[PDB]
Amino acid sequence: AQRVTFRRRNPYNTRSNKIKVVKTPGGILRAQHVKKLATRPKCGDCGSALQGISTLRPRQYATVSKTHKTVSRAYGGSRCANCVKERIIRAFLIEEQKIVKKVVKEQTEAAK
Amino acid sequence: GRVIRNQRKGAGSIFTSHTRLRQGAAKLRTLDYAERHGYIRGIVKQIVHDSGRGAPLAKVVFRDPYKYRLREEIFIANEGVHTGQFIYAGKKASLNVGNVLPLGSVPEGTIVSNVEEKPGDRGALARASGNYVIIIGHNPDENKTRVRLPSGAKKVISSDARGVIGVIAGGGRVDKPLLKAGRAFHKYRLKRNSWPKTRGVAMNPVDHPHGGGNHQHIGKASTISRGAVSGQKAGLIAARRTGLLR
Amino acid sequence: AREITDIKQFLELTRRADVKTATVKINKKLNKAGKPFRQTKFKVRGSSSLYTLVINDAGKAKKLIQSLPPTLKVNRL
């Protein structure tokens, strides 16, 4: 049957102003302001949240070791590893067929 | 008297456009060397919804010729484009939906949209959804082209004016009854303050030329001279005929 | 606000030269279900942190207290 207030001068229920209700050691309920949740980083290609990265707020990554912010593939903390699997396939087989095109332009000289 | 409601839109205070959610100005690419001597390829990254407009937009990402980077631009999306499509742009490009060519490079009877009035204005004509112009003929000397504007007017433009192949997406839009005053409210909040419209009949002799009288009626002809003057003009303006068609 | 597990690692921080003071807390608890025992904690104060070692077997806890360095000024209980 206890009731509790804001601990700050913002009376209003806005997005930053959230409250959690905490039982202190001194027996009383008291409100606790909570910070907005962290979003997982996204693949810049497929958009699916790319696993292995720690989910923090933006400036809380400046405080963290580099193993949290990365994986050990090429394009580690950036693309989702199935978007890296493709662009290796696509880089090899496009510049594969692209060699076959440049011999035909030598043959089309001597064939005509 | 008073200053009437259509005279009151010029000073543009609460009548300006509601611009917040708009992705940008949809234009074609600046006319450069690579496009007028050859073609340059982008790909369409995502085709997306623009607020206040009726037709979707596409974002195609080109490669800057003279500096290392990407540049992405806003095209009004023709119907049939899809993300992952190569979009070719230039004089030597090919005739396929979404490729922007000069108009001199396409045969007569070709359906293009977002065509330019003059070369390098980055698009004018037929930008609304479902519209297109047809190319009905050429004039290879003193170069021009004969095209049919979506209204049915026949205009003659330069042959260096680009245009993008196909019909603009968002066709069929006005087929659907709007059904309630709410859905017309959500339409014009993203456009401008035009709505709702009080009939000038229903207001006072100050508010309008149609106002006053112990009955609701106009009292003089509702067709006004083109040579009318500021604020006299309300009603059907300089009409050649009037009344239901037969 | 940290905890140490190995006894040896605790013997290091006591010499780490940032540690001016320590303390020994005695807590009487019980284990398993039935019977009690005497539990002690050693709290060494760093500059930026407070380390503690928990000794639940009193056969070890006495050999440790004598082993504390003489410079470290200990507040017992």
Partner: protein, 91 residues
């Protein structure tokens, strides 16, 4: 259990708006909420997100199209007319 007889999807509008208008909307809103085959992935995932934009949830292709339906009427005869003029010059 078919429930309603005539009105179908427009039963949400109740008795209001008049029978024609409610029947003329029932024409389109069965098109815009319908589920279409996907010309790329080979499944039918395609649904409308907004006027003009049609999104596959399988192959993640987005496809521009008609407002209330995938392929507009006057469009399918543009990509044939464009297919014909292309071959005209290359044949």
């Amino acid at each position: 259990a078919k429930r309603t007889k005539k009105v179908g999807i427009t039963g949400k509008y109740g008795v209001r708006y008049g029978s024609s208008l409610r029947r003329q909307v029932k024409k389109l809103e069965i098109q815009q909420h319908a589920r279409y085959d996907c010309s790329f992935c080979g499944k039918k995932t395609v649904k409308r997100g907004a006027a003009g934009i049609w999104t596959c949830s399988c192959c993640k292709k987005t496809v521009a199209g008609g407002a209330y339906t995938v392929s507009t009427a006057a469009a399918a005869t543009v990509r044939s007319t464009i297919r014909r003029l292309r071959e005209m010059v290359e044949a």
